[PDB]
PDB file of C-alpha atoms and ligand atoms in Angstrom:
ATOM      1  CA  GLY A   1      11.558   7.130 -79.886  1.00  0.00           C
ATOM      2  CA  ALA A   2      10.226   7.501 -76.377  1.00  0.00           C
ATOM      3  CA  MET A   3      12.650  10.607 -74.872  1.00  0.00           C
ATOM      4  CA  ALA A   4      13.268   7.870 -71.888  1.00  0.00           C
ATOM      5  CA  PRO A   5      11.940   4.602 -72.639  1.00  0.00           C
ATOM      6  CA  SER A   6      10.603   2.570 -69.823  1.00  0.00           C
ATOM      7  CA  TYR A   7       8.223  -0.151 -69.250  1.00  0.00           C
ATOM      8  CA  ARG A   8       4.966  -0.137 -67.330  1.00  0.00           C
ATOM      9  CA  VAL A   9       2.673  -2.973 -66.846  1.00  0.00           C
ATOM     10  CA  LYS A  10      -1.609  -2.059 -66.233  1.00  0.00           C
ATOM     11  CA  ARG A  11      -3.904  -4.507 -64.838  1.00  0.00           C
ATOM     12  CA  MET A  12      -7.421  -3.605 -67.256  1.00  0.00           C
ATOM     13  CA  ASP A  13      -7.987  -4.701 -70.859  1.00  0.00           C
ATOM     14  CA  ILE A  14      -5.861  -3.998 -73.729  1.00  0.00           C
ATOM     15  CA  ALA A  15      -8.515  -2.904 -75.798  1.00  0.00           C
ATOM     16  CA  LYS A  16      -8.624   0.193 -73.892  1.00  0.00           C
ATOM     17  CA  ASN A  17      -4.360   1.173 -74.054  1.00  0.00           C
ATOM     18  CA  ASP A  18      -3.159   4.399 -74.254  1.00  0.00           C
ATOM     19  CA  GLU A  19      -0.325   3.732 -77.121  1.00  0.00           C
ATOM     20  CA  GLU A  20       0.376   4.430 -80.488  1.00  0.00           C
ATOM     21  CA  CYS A  21      -0.381   0.743 -81.597  1.00  0.00           C
ATOM     22  CA  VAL A  22      -1.364  -2.618 -79.672  1.00  0.00           C
ATOM     23  CA  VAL A  23      -0.136  -6.397 -80.215  1.00  0.00           C
ATOM     24  CA  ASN A  24      -2.629  -8.866 -80.025  1.00  0.00           C
ATOM     25  CA  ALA A  25      -2.316 -12.407 -78.537  1.00  0.00           C
ATOM     26  CA  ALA A  26      -3.554 -14.126 -81.635  1.00  0.00           C
ATOM     27  CA  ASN A  27      -4.083 -17.462 -83.547  1.00  0.00           C
ATOM     28  CA  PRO A  28      -2.123 -18.607 -86.460  1.00  0.00           C
ATOM     29  CA  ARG A  29      -5.838 -18.760 -88.500  1.00  0.00           C
ATOM     30  CA  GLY A  30      -6.795 -14.619 -87.520  1.00  0.00           C
ATOM     31  CA  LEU A  31      -9.949 -16.000 -86.487  1.00  0.00           C
ATOM     32  CA  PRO A  32     -11.635 -14.232 -83.868  1.00  0.00           C
ATOM     33  CA  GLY A  33     -10.353 -16.524 -81.277  1.00  0.00           C
ATOM     34  CA  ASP A  34     -10.877 -16.052 -77.230  1.00  0.00           C
ATOM     35  CA  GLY A  35      -9.385 -13.513 -74.288  1.00  0.00           C
ATOM     36  CA  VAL A  36      -7.436 -10.401 -75.857  1.00  0.00           C
ATOM     37  CA  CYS A  37      -8.024 -12.227 -79.111  1.00  0.00           C
ATOM     38  CA  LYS A  38     -11.582 -11.301 -78.525  1.00  0.00           C
ATOM     39  CA  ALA A  39     -11.313  -7.883 -76.947  1.00  0.00           C
ATOM     40  CA  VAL A  40      -8.643  -7.075 -80.191  1.00  0.00           C
ATOM     41  CA  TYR A  41     -11.831  -8.540 -82.779  1.00  0.00           C
ATOM     42  CA  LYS A  42     -14.514  -6.550 -81.051  1.00  0.00           C
ATOM     43  CA  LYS A  43     -12.314  -3.442 -81.185  1.00  0.00           C
ATOM     44  CA  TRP A  44     -10.362  -3.328 -84.701  1.00  0.00           C
ATOM     45  CA  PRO A  45     -12.307  -6.040 -86.081  1.00  0.00           C
ATOM     46  CA  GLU A  46     -11.117  -4.409 -89.859  1.00  0.00           C
ATOM     47  CA  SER A  47      -7.320  -5.409 -88.379  1.00  0.00           C
ATOM     48  CA  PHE A  48      -8.373  -9.330 -89.142  1.00  0.00           C
ATOM     49  CA  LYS A  49      -7.856  -8.875 -92.681  1.00  0.00           C
ATOM     50  CA  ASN A  50      -5.604 -11.307 -94.263  1.00  0.00           C
ATOM     51  CA  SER A  51      -4.003 -11.319 -90.505  1.00  0.00           C
ATOM     52  CA  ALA A  52      -3.285 -15.288 -90.535  1.00  0.00           C
ATOM     53  CA  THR A  53       0.508 -16.491 -90.435  1.00  0.00           C
ATOM     54  CA  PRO A  54       2.086 -18.903 -88.477  1.00  0.00           C
ATOM     55  CA  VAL A  55       3.643 -19.895 -85.007  1.00  0.00           C
ATOM     56  CA  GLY A  56       6.262 -18.133 -83.994  1.00  0.00           C
ATOM     57  CA  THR A  57       5.337 -14.831 -86.056  1.00  0.00           C
ATOM     58  CA  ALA A  58       3.937 -11.517 -86.786  1.00  0.00           C
ATOM     59  CA  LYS A  59       1.788  -9.030 -88.979  1.00  0.00           C
ATOM     60  CA  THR A  60       0.806  -6.018 -88.860  1.00  0.00           C
ATOM     61  CA  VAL A  61      -2.638  -4.787 -90.586  1.00  0.00           C
ATOM     62  CA  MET A  62      -4.224  -1.432 -90.146  1.00  0.00           C
ATOM     63  CA  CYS A  63      -6.980  -0.243 -89.044  1.00  0.00           C
ATOM     64  CA  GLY A  64      -6.914   3.134 -89.734  1.00  0.00           C
ATOM     65  CA  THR A  65      -3.877   4.227 -89.051  1.00  0.00           C
ATOM     66  CA  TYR A  66      -3.935   2.605 -86.232  1.00  0.00           C
ATOM     67  CA  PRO A  67      -1.661  -0.736 -86.259  1.00  0.00           C
ATOM     68  CA  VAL A  68      -2.415  -3.597 -84.687  1.00  0.00           C
ATOM     69  CA  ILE A  69       0.150  -6.093 -84.703  1.00  0.00           C
ATOM     70  CA  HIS A  70      -0.735  -9.542 -84.732  1.00  0.00           C
ATOM     71  CA  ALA A  71       1.781 -11.868 -82.457  1.00  0.00           C
ATOM     72  CA  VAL A  72       1.180 -15.997 -82.509  1.00  0.00           C
ATOM     73  CA  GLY A  73       2.353 -17.897 -79.892  1.00  0.00           C
ATOM     74  CA  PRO A  74       2.530 -21.442 -79.715  1.00  0.00           C
ATOM     75  CA  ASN A  75       0.037 -23.899 -77.966  1.00  0.00           C
ATOM     76  CA  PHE A  76       1.878 -25.903 -75.423  1.00  0.00           C
ATOM     77  CA  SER A  77      -0.782 -28.328 -75.554  1.00  0.00           C
ATOM     78  CA  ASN A  78       0.898 -29.080 -79.217  1.00  0.00           C
ATOM     79  CA  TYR A  79       4.422 -27.845 -78.623  1.00  0.00           C
ATOM     80  CA  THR A  80       6.967 -29.493 -76.653  1.00  0.00           C
ATOM     81  CA  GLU A  81       8.794 -27.711 -73.598  1.00  0.00           C
ATOM     82  CA  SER A  82      11.640 -26.973 -76.383  1.00  0.00           C
ATOM     83  CA  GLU A  83       9.807 -26.573 -79.222  1.00  0.00           C
ATOM     84  CA  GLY A  84       8.010 -23.929 -77.630  1.00  0.00           C
ATOM     85  CA  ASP A  85       9.947 -22.265 -75.574  1.00  0.00           C
ATOM     86  CA  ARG A  86      11.217 -21.379 -78.770  1.00  0.00           C
ATOM     87  CA  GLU A  87       8.701 -20.014 -81.302  1.00  0.00           C
ATOM     88  CA  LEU A  88       7.558 -18.005 -78.249  1.00  0.00           C
ATOM     89  CA  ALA A  89      11.106 -16.367 -78.054  1.00  0.00           C
ATOM     90  CA  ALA A  90      10.681 -16.095 -82.113  1.00  0.00           C
ATOM     91  CA  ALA A  91       7.621 -14.331 -81.633  1.00  0.00           C
ATOM     92  CA  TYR A  92       8.496 -11.544 -79.448  1.00  0.00           C
ATOM     93  CA  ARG A  93      11.823 -11.015 -81.417  1.00  0.00           C
ATOM     94  CA  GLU A  94       9.091 -10.084 -84.463  1.00  0.00           C
ATOM     95  CA  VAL A  95       6.795  -7.744 -82.473  1.00  0.00           C
ATOM     96  CA  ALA A  96       9.910  -5.969 -82.001  1.00  0.00           C
ATOM     97  CA  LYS A  97      10.886  -5.766 -85.510  1.00  0.00           C
ATOM     98  CA  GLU A  98       7.712  -4.481 -86.258  1.00  0.00           C
ATOM     99  CA  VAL A  99       7.535  -1.958 -83.551  1.00  0.00           C
ATOM    100  CA  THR A 100      10.511  -0.778 -85.224  1.00  0.00           C
ATOM    101  CA  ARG A 101       9.540  -0.677 -88.504  1.00  0.00           C
ATOM    102  CA  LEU A 102       6.311   0.768 -87.992  1.00  0.00           C
ATOM    103  CA  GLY A 103       8.665   4.219 -85.918  1.00  0.00           C
ATOM    104  CA  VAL A 104       6.329   4.155 -82.763  1.00  0.00           C
ATOM    105  CA  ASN A 105       7.193   5.915 -79.682  1.00  0.00           C
ATOM    106  CA  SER A 106       5.088   3.475 -78.296  1.00  0.00           C
ATOM    107  CA  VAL A 107       3.020  -0.209 -77.628  1.00  0.00           C
ATOM    108  CA  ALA A 108       0.403  -2.493 -75.442  1.00  0.00           C
ATOM    109  CA  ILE A 109       1.739  -5.760 -75.401  1.00  0.00           C
ATOM    110  CA  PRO A 110      -0.051  -9.009 -73.645  1.00  0.00           C
ATOM    111  CA  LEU A 111       2.134 -11.989 -72.459  1.00  0.00           C
ATOM    112  CA  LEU A 112       2.023 -14.489 -75.230  1.00  0.00           C
ATOM    113  CA  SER A 113       1.064 -17.918 -74.231  1.00  0.00           C
ATOM    114  CA  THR A 114       0.491 -17.135 -70.936  1.00  0.00           C
ATOM    115  CA  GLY A 115      -3.599 -17.791 -71.675  1.00  0.00           C
ATOM    116  CA  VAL A 116      -5.580 -20.788 -73.031  1.00  0.00           C
ATOM    117  CA  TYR A 117      -2.232 -21.601 -75.023  1.00  0.00           C
ATOM    118  CA  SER A 118      -0.136 -22.733 -71.481  1.00  0.00           C
ATOM    119  CA  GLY A 119      -1.189 -26.117 -71.617  1.00  0.00           C
ATOM    120  CA  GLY A 120      -1.790 -25.757 -68.016  1.00  0.00           C
ATOM    121  CA  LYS A 121       1.100 -24.089 -65.745  1.00  0.00           C
ATOM    122  CA  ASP A 122       2.023 -20.591 -65.098  1.00  0.00           C
ATOM    123  CA  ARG A 123       4.335 -19.653 -67.431  1.00  0.00           C
ATOM    124  CA  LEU A 124       4.800 -15.527 -66.217  1.00  0.00           C
ATOM    125  CA  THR A 125       8.292 -15.711 -66.176  1.00  0.00           C
ATOM    126  CA  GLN A 126       8.972 -17.142 -69.369  1.00  0.00           C
ATOM    127  CA  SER A 127       7.132 -15.022 -71.330  1.00  0.00           C
ATOM    128  CA  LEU A 128       8.057 -11.550 -69.825  1.00  0.00           C
ATOM    129  CA  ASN A 129      11.604 -12.577 -69.902  1.00  0.00           C
ATOM    130  CA  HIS A 130      11.235 -13.087 -73.726  1.00  0.00           C
ATOM    131  CA  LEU A 131       8.870 -10.008 -74.268  1.00  0.00           C
ATOM    132  CA  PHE A 132      12.076  -8.162 -72.455  1.00  0.00           C
ATOM    133  CA  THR A 133      14.920 -10.162 -74.415  1.00  0.00           C
ATOM    134  CA  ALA A 134      13.404  -9.034 -77.588  1.00  0.00           C
ATOM    135  CA  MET A 135      12.281  -4.944 -76.437  1.00  0.00           C
ATOM    136  CA  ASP A 136      15.513  -4.033 -74.241  1.00  0.00           C
ATOM    137  CA  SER A 137      16.776  -3.141 -77.759  1.00  0.00           C
ATOM    138  CA  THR A 138      13.698  -1.306 -78.902  1.00  0.00           C
ATOM    139  CA  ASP A 139      13.059   2.721 -77.569  1.00  0.00           C
ATOM    140  CA  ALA A 140       9.767   2.148 -78.113  1.00  0.00           C
ATOM    141  CA  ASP A 141       8.011   2.844 -74.428  1.00  0.00           C
ATOM    142  CA  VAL A 142       6.136  -0.500 -73.653  1.00  0.00           C
ATOM    143  CA  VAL A 143       2.851  -0.853 -71.178  1.00  0.00           C
ATOM    144  CA  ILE A 144       2.082  -4.715 -70.645  1.00  0.00           C
ATOM    145  CA  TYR A 145      -1.495  -5.685 -70.053  1.00  0.00           C
ATOM    146  CA  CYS A 146      -2.664  -8.393 -67.807  1.00  0.00           C
ATOM    147  CA  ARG A 147      -6.143  -9.125 -66.119  1.00  0.00           C
ATOM    148  CA  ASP A 148      -5.166 -11.043 -62.307  1.00  0.00           C
ATOM    149  CA  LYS A 149      -4.304  -8.892 -59.565  1.00  0.00           C
ATOM    150  CA  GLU A 150      -0.626 -11.309 -58.386  1.00  0.00           C
ATOM    151  CA  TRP A 151       0.612 -11.144 -62.182  1.00  0.00           C
ATOM    152  CA  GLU A 152       0.388  -6.747 -62.132  1.00  0.00           C
ATOM    153  CA  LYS A 153       2.158  -7.192 -58.596  1.00  0.00           C
ATOM    154  CA  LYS A 154       5.264  -9.954 -59.717  1.00  0.00           C
ATOM    155  CA  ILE A 155       5.282  -8.263 -63.374  1.00  0.00           C
ATOM    156  CA  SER A 156       5.471  -5.127 -61.741  1.00  0.00           C
ATOM    157  CA  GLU A 157       8.289  -6.684 -59.309  1.00  0.00           C
ATOM    158  CA  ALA A 158      10.086  -8.144 -61.733  1.00  0.00           C
ATOM    159  CA  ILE A 159      10.316  -4.288 -63.907  1.00  0.00           C
ATOM    160  CA  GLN A 160      11.419  -2.939 -60.731  1.00  0.00           C
ATOM    161  CA  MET A 161      14.257  -5.669 -60.288  1.00  0.00           C
ATOM    162  CA  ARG A 162      16.376  -4.570 -63.180  1.00  0.00           C
ATOM    163  CA  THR A 163      16.134  -0.279 -62.795  1.00  0.00           C
TER     164      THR A 163
HETATM  165 CL1  LIG B   1     -11.142  -2.771 -68.525  1.00  0.00          CL
HETATM  166 CL1  LIG B   2      -2.590 -17.278 -74.421  1.00  0.00          CL
HETATM  167 CL1  LIG B   3      -3.231 -12.133 -66.328  1.00  0.00          CL
END
């Protein structure tokens, strides 16, 4: 476990993370994809061997000894708001199980379903709150990765408001 488990946010490419494992914002088919998924494919391509897994699940594949947790959020283009919200919660719960099983002291994590799976809506708060519900019972240091300057400020504010 971490000595004083924390949340932090950084605005940079998650493929350059300083944590003991990474969460990929994967597609269900284990394809290279776009955005976070394509950065993860370039950095850890070996982790895409048999990485396909259903929506609402996470599947870990090692790249050497470095764990890549492939977490499949719902595409809100296809899911109803109700069923998508349930699957997005479930994906983060499966991430927390994997992080616990691996015994890591730190994890790098993107906001699932906030990019091309957002169905054209701002889901910062929805996705971050499901991240917190799952990860609050874990003792890993959690480092959230984002790319937008305004999102960095809002995630930082949300972390600080609980402390
Ligand atoms: Cl960067
Ligand atoms: Cl996405
Ligand atoms: Cl972002």
